[PDB]
Symmetry: C5
Subunit: 287 residues, 5 copies
Amino acid sequence: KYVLDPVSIKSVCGGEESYIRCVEYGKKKAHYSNLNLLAKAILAGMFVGLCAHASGIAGGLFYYHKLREIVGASMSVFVYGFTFPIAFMCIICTGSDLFTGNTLAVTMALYEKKVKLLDYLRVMTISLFGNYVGAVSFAFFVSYLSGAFTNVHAVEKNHFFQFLNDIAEKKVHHTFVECVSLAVGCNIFVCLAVYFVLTLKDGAGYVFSVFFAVYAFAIAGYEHIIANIYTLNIALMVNTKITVYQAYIKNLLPTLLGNYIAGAIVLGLPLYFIYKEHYYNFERSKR
Amino acid sequence: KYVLDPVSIKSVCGGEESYIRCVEYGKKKAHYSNLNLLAKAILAGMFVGLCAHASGIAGGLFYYHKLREIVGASMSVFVYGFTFPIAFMCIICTGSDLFTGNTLAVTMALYEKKVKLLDYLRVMTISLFGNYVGAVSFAFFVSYLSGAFTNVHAVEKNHFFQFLNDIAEKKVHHTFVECVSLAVGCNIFVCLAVYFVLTLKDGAGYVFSVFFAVYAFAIAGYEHIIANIYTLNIALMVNTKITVYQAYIKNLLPTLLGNYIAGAIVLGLPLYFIYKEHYYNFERSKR
Amino acid sequence: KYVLDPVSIKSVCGGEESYIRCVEYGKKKAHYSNLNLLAKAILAGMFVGLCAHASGIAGGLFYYHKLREIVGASMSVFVYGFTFPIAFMCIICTGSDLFTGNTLAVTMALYEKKVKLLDYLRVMTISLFGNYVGAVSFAFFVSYLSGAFTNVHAVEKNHFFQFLNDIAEKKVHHTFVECVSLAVGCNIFVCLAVYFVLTLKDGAGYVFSVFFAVYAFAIAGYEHIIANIYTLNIALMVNTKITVYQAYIKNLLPTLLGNYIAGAIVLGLPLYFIYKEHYYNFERSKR
Amino acid sequence: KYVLDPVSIKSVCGGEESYIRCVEYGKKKAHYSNLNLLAKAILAGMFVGLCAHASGIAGGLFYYHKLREIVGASMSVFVYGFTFPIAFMCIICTGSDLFTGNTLAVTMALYEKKVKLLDYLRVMTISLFGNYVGAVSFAFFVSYLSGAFTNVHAVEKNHFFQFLNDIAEKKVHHTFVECVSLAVGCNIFVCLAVYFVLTLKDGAGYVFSVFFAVYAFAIAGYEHIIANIYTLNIALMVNTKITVYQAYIKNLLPTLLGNYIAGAIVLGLPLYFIYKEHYYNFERSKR
Amino acid sequence: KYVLDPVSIKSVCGGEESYIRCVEYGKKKAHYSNLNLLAKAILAGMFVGLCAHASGIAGGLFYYHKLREIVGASMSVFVYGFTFPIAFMCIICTGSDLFTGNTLAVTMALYEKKVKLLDYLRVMTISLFGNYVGAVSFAFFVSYLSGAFTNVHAVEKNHFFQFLNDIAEKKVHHTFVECVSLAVGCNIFVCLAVYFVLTLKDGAGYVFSVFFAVYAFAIAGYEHIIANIYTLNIALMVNTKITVYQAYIKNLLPTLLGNYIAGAIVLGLPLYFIYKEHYYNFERSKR
């Protein structure tokens, strides 16, 4: 028995089905309990801190002072962006929730009258607080207590502290509008990575679409709020040149504002206007 | 219970089914409303601008003045072509429409008498105008307002402005025939990437065929009209050496002409001549 | 409802089914009309010329005269072999026919008495002529008219012409037996890539098996007849050091002979001897 | 017959199904016999030693003394982390058991009252002892007896011994708390790789999620107990600078403690609290 | 009609099903005729010689004498290990048999009383003889007759002969025990690659698991018998420094012994002890 023509399959979907999957995905976050959503948010912040520690070590390896004289910071940022995107896979495969992914899906479910307003504010507040707690807890209990980014004062050995110092100094010197624009550019990639998870339902579609999307903002200098919550706090712990006013007012608040703008307004509102009749049809065809 | 021989499946199709899928894909664009097609075109131009900003930063990192003395512009163009092809995935997974993808599919549906002539002109005009608006809006609101490509006048720090300046000077110095030929070579790759999306219906077939096809024209110096609409306008915004006559007459019009020629004539007309009887059989077997 | 054990599937086949698929694939080429087969051959030659232009630009970028002093021609040939293999995906996904792929499949169908002798000669002649016409048409209308490989006489800028000149001089200096042996080594990889397309019926199996198989012959210095038809003609157009006698007698005829030998004799005849009883059963089980 | 819309499939699962699959996976380890579990543990330790020997040779190639002066140890650690993650695939595809993977799954089955306490201690003890025996047996019978890491005393040839010496000296100079923190960071990645195997049920989902997860801790300097059992014992065999007290007390005991903490407490207990009602529903729907 | 939850599939199997598939795979080799098995073995040796010629050229490109002064032999061995693993795909997709793959599967079928003893000796002898004939035939008719590894005596051009000379001198200087240990380490990877083909039944699972497994022994300096049969014979043909006693007694003999030991004893006997009751149940459930 020989098979000449096998069964034709497909592991992808259209734009209408991707919109309906995203609205149904954001609708489920409002039905968890408070402690369940809080534990998932703390786990997601911990995963972000884990892979950002790994990326900082991998980028400070290529920030060696003799290699830095020839290539600058190019290979450091490339190996950082290569090492980082597994955090999103760790978040998705355990079912954890990130705030920047929720800014598209839960807001889309708010637009479609699937989530109430107080439930929306409750979900977003609990998700942001849990992501902060998880990222700062990983920055203290693993990153600070292992001594990986300690200032060791010798230029042939200090290339991990110096990479953390220069990265934390670069992202704390923007003006308000520049940090808001870079955060908008970040969260468009992050929400599109969530959309890729909802669309391409196989292993390579999970791994490599999210890999290219997260590498693309990690190498562009775009500003993610949870990765900055990890990075600026570990940079404050190991005593880099930044201060706490520079960390929280000059980076974290414009990053939060731009990340919310890119998910709720730039991406969610045109896609709602495009596919709201398809969501209306899907729902009517359930009676 | 042990499975010795599983069920034989297949996530690919033949050339006849790919042609029928492309004609049916281009036939659907003439049935959207004007505002729906306009919003999808604006979103596609925004995605092109997003990943071209990311690619310009990733290429200007490797354009550091000490690395540039050894390797020239080789690693800059390679990392640009590595970072760019996720834009096409962002366009496909949200259901947005690009003009260069439409030049094959909607013209094929025009040849098969599925789209009328005024509907064809309406769809192409709305798609080109929306792609222009989205790309220039991203070039101003994110790329210009973040200060990423500002001339900072110091050779150890000016490697983002200098990469943008040299790229925008290289693609503005062609003659008419050279720019038309490079645009033809670009849009053959872009229309083949659309054909790859219609053929390989899984996650790796979406990601990596489009990756190799878009990297191949990004490293070849081929001319894409929407990427040039982004790049020459951000190069005019940050005050590179090019002028607006050089940007619009010496690059953009021959790129539009060559991109339309490669989709409507070079690729669409032989494929129509090859597979029009298979499309006739597909239609005849629906009565 | 939770899925603990999903449905076991398989997107691969055995050697007997791959042989039967290859004989049935080569049997279909003798049933097209002459103009249909001619148009598919012209499209395949055009795709080969397209991705060879892209690979020549990508390899001449890394052939910069300061990088060439350190690494030689290693990174140029690696980036050429990285950029090239998407040509075969273009050929496969549109349904075009290449001569070197046909030398295995149509000859296997000739051995199994599925194609007559005059139909075999007609199919091979039309395929070779159309591939030549498509490759020389792309070499003139895109590669020559864009000025990408023009001798610009300055050593810091002439690294595209110099890469084309040195590649075209390297592959024109072989003796007859050396060029025949390198062509045999090429067409074994090309016919195995066709066999990979017939065996692995998913997107990653299409992309990456063909990628590794075509990169392996592009970095080995093996001789492909259609890629040489493009390369030696564009090298004659931009006035490199080779002549037309060296291009056509010293390279193209031994490449044609070795490419036919590797498909019809080295690969097709042992596989026919191995799997002809399976093809006999497959045919006997259709009555 | 043309297929326009194929059958929609999916090779991924949700978080609840991944939890149920992990509890059912850890429940099966307590039902093997003692010799079966011991043989699987010895095979897993042998695979870890195999791919760590391969990674040590691949990293000592890039630790050449003229390349080490420019890039430091960056390319050595990158090629180590590139070469290493196939060990886990070798462990999964043969059905072998690793201790660090078991610390999540068997502890989750202990929390759900599926494994008794003495069965838990028996499974963990037999798994750790077999992994130790397999790793030290590969370190002697292949790594030591082949002479690959012999001190050859000449700086142009000693780059395998020097890479092993510097890696074994770096991971033996930590304090207790630093080694515990790095081991926690390691076993979060290892348990998430086990979770990726249970979630993404296709070939790319097996290969590349595990690749990125294991590369991410191999480049971060995180501490795996079985890889350290191989590495410190082969470093003691070829007479590096470390001692047996430094190997066993200063590295191996804090690595065991942190690896158990990250699987049983950091990852297993929140996921149990999140998904224990879904496991209760899965069991209630089997009567 | 929108698909919200598609059909859950799986392209992987467990360890018991992989063992049963391996025993049934090795049991089929004893049922071929002598000429069929001989032709498949000759084809497998030819494929090994093909991709080893390609890997030798790709590694001698990066062995350029100015690059060799900085990085040593690191990039040469990396590009060799990158280029090599497509040989295994060429062997699998045509249905050819390699001796090193057979040492696990046919010995497992011997342990399960599925193959008799004389049939076992006949299959192993015919497979080894055909692999030798195919590898030496490719080493003469393609590798030697093309002049690719000729000593050209100029240090700026002799980097293919010098890479072949130094590789053939490195692998001929081991002691008996060192070559046996390196051959054991090789054939564990080769038999695990065969196991990966039997387990992961999709295109990425075929390509990339075999890629990483074969790259891992190609960069580790592990000794494969068929690749050494090619390499030492082409090194004797182009007159390197080795002799025929060094080639056949000091390398080939211990490589054959270690490759048989790693398949029949190290890997086959524990896996037989683990899964023989599952094979008994699989057979008992066929009556």
